[PDB]
Amino acid sequence: MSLGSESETGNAVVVFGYREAITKQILAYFAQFGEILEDLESELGDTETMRTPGYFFQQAPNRRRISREHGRTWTKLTYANHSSYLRALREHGTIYCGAAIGCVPYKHELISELSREGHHHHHH
């Protein structure tokens, strides 16, 4: 593998248990840190909540909205900062739309499992 040792990314989490019908709503909360899904129209008219470790969000409308690889029901959110990582981690009784969302630390084996149920690409 590209990475060595036995650890994770550390500043990236795997979020699963969401649907593309809650993007406008759920994204608004986490928007402080970054974006989650691809369907986003008019996001934070003012302030922009000084989100992203780059002040502004770098993504092109001619490509995928999210530059991170996302699956059917899971996405890899990388904030580069541990503070955002831990805050977005939640998993402390966080129930959204009637179901608890799963924000876990990056695990390679988990991705393989996720891609099995949430088949999206070959090899990936």
What residue spans define the domains of the chain?
1-124
3-state helix, strand, coil in the chain (%, to 5): 25, 15, 60
Which of these, 96, 120, 106, 115, lies nearest to 30 by C-alpha position?
96
Contacts of 89 (CB under 8 A, 6+ apart): 13, 103, 105
Identify the experimental approach: NMR
**What is d(CA 58, CA 56) in angstroms, rounded to the nearest whole number?**
6
* Second CATH level (architecture) for the domain 1-124: 2-Layer Sandwich (3.30)
Q: What angle do CA 93, 24, 19 make, to 5 degrees?
A: 60
Backbone φ and ψ of 71, nearest 5°: -110, -155
